[PDB]
């Protein structure tokens, strides 16, 4: 028979392929956060739309209802744990005010750039892809990793990286080799 494992999509197309303002705004965001395609913007938009839909549905529902209490507390806890709400705006009405730059600020790339530790956002993306970064004793190499609140104080270089106290790379060792046979003969 067919396998019982399933799958789902994560993005969507804009329905209007040549609108000028949307295109300029997307280029703004891509150049600001150093991304690859329009697909990344579209996937973040998809996620935000799901969140907002849940919030709207709960807000229509009766005050001090059981379903409202349970699901609203769960959603607010998730949002505050992700690092998107804060402390004085956990009210299920500040969820509807969340914008795209809010979510797109939590990527490991932006965090690695902002925490010193890298000269540029493109440099940040290159370092993540070359196994130089850890998030709490686990080495991570995916720039779309979204950092949670209790994990943003453990970002650091990896112990197996030349930038974090290990042997140097394939270029240093070859230069040192060649220099050794030059200086011993």
């Amino acid at each position: 028979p067919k396998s019982y494992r399933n799958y789902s999509k994560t993005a969507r197309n804009p329905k209007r392929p040549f609108e000028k303002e949307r295109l300029d705004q997307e280029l703004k965001l891509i150049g600001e956060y150093g991304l690859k395609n329009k697909r990344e913007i579209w996937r973040v938009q998809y996620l935000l739309a799901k969140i907002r839909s849940a919030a709207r549905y709960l807000l229509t529902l009766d005050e001090k209802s059981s379903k409202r209490i349970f699901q609203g507390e769960a959603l607010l806890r998730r949002m505050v744990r992700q690092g998107l709400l804060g402390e004085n705006e956990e009210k299920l009405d500040y969820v509807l005010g969340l914008t795209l730059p809010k979510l797109l600020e939590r990527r490991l790339q932006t965090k690695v750039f902002k925490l010193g530790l890298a000269k540029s956002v493109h440099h940040a993306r290159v370092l993540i892809r070359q196994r130089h970064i850890r998030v709490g004793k686990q080495m991570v190499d995916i720039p779309s990793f979204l950092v949670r609140v209790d994990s943003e104080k453990h970002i650091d270089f990896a112990t197996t990286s030349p930038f974090g106290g290990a042997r140097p790379g394939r270029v240093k060792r070859k230069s040192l080799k060649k220099q050794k046979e030059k200086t011993e003969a």
Binding site: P1, Y4, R5, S66, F70
Partner: protein, 257 residues
């Protein structure tokens, strides 16, 4: 041909067995015996999935070959024998005793009773028959015939049965004040007392049960099991004592570190 079916597919097995939806296309397909398929659990599931003693089916087999597992005081070697509600289990090698019960969800658990409690169980009466010579026989939920039943026993109350000898010790009536456990939909491990009985003529009888937190629920008559008099129960209960909280306060409790 179109005869009796012999196989069971995994996604069609009863959901309270909690079988992985990967790793296989089949389920153990319990045998015929004292309990129905849907109100029971095979011995392989108990002894591999729950207690984690075996890692495969073949290890359950090599456990049961050496005759050390007794249900209701008799050794069994059938890997798909049905094990049912009030049944006591003894593993001689480890010197352990269990009784299956429902938790507040619909899933069976082994309760880990002691040795003195391991000498009896409770059976509920399903019907009473009159046979040749005007002798009475009782039929229990356990698929069991009891001859020479007491004249004051009716077709819905419960009795307490000795296991070394199949004789009756005492019986408990089915009244307004009796203590009950419920065994079907929407409320499967709930314990309450009883509030009222309805007795609709051609259709089902509805009865109401009041919890120890003054919560009220109702169900059919045919899924009610009397387990004590007004004061106290006659068996030990799992940790929760049949007290079902709702999701909000259950979640609140689970977050107490």
């Amino acid at each position: 041909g179109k005869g009796i079916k012999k196989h069971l597919k995994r996604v069609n097995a009863p959901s309270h067995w909690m079988l992985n939806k990967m790793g296989g296309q089949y389920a153990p397909k319990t045998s015929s015996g004292p309990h129905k398929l849907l109100e029971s659990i095979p011995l392989v599931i108990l002894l591999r999935n729950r207690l984690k003693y075996a890692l495969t089916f073949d290890e359950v087999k090599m456990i049961l070959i050496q005759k050390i597992v007794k249900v209701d005081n008799k050794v069994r070697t059938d890997c798909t024998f049905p094990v049912g509600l009030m049944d006591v289990i003894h593993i001689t090698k480890s010197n352990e005793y269990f009784r299956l019960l429902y938790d507040i969800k619909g899933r069976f658990v082994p309760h880990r009773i002691t040795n003195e409690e391991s000498k009896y169980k409770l059976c509920k009466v399903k019907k009473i028959l009159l046979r040749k010579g005007r002798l009475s026989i009782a039929v229990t939920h356990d698929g069991r015939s009891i001859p020479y039943i007491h004249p004051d026993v009716k077709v819905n109350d419960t009795v307490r049965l000795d296991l070394e000898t199949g004789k009756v010790l005492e019986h408990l009536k089915f009244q307004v004040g009796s203590l009950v456990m419920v065994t079907a939909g929407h409320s499967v491990g709930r314990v309450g007392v009883i509030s009222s009985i309805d007795k609709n003529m051609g259709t089902y009888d509805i009865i109401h049960v009041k919890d120890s937190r003054n919560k009220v629920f109702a169900t059919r008559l045919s899924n009610v099991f009397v387990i004590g008099d007004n004061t106290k129960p006659y068996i030990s209960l799992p940790r929760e004592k049949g007290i079902k909280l709702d999701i909000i306060e259950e979640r609140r409790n689970r977050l107490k570190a």
